[PDB]
Amino acid sequence: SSFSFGGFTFKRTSGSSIKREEEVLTGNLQTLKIRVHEGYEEFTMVGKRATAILRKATRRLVQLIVSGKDEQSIAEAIIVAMVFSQEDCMIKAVRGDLNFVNRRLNPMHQLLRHFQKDAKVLFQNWGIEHIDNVMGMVGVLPDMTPSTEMSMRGIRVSKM
Ligand SMILES: CC1([C@@H](CC(=O)O)Nc2nc(-c3c[nH]c4ncc(F)cc34)ncc2F)CCC1
């Protein structure tokens, strides 16, 4: 049971979820109704220029291991994973002048379209964490600089 989202083919490799229609608040205090997936799941994300392993719980990204052609491809996959995770810090990153969702249309696609234009606020607001040894995997900073000390929460970059 494969599906498509933001240019990526997702395939659930483990777990399951049930859905619940829920109301969430953006950074502009706008209410959006989203279909929340409850449960722990593991996916493969296959795109034309990046691939990834995503592990998520209800509105929480546990870990994302990304591989890709370059910084832009990888960032593109990171944006989709973050939006897909349904995390509240991703929702709270929708803010400021003109940044309102036009509310039958799917709000997940609307959130994606919003962050694809500029993921600067999404990437800042996400948070950063210290990393462990794990080699062949590097941390990535909000501005896409690689680091061996720190990375955005749960985000790891693997070599192609
Ligand atoms: C078109 C999307 C989504 C719409 C929906 O919820 O039915 N479609 C699917 N999501 C998930 C699915 C499974 N687990 C999920 N966790 C979060 C999440 F946003 C979606 C899922 N599984 C299968 C889907 F077809 C919007 C993101 C892809």
Curated annotation (Swiss-Prot):
It is found in: Virion; Host nucleus; Host mitochondrion. Belongs to the influenza viruses PB2 family. Influenza RNA polymerase is composed of three subunits: PB1, PB2 and PA. Interacts (via N-terminus) with PB1 (via C-terminus). Interacts with nucleoprotein NP (via N-terminus). Interacts (via N-terminus) with host MAVS (via N-terminus); this interaction inhibits host innate immune response. Plays an essential role in transcription initiation and cap-stealing mechanism, in which cellular capped pre-mRNAs are used to generate primers for viral transcription. Recognizes and binds the 7-methylguanosine-containing cap of the target pre-RNA which is subsequently cleaved after 10-13 nucleotides by the viral protein PA. Plays a role in the initiation of the viral genome replication and modulates the activity of the ribonucleoprotein (RNP) complex. This is Polymerase basic protein 2. It comes from Influenza A virus (strain A/Beijing/39/1975 H3N2). The gene is PB2. The chain holds residues 321 to 483 of 759 of the full protein.
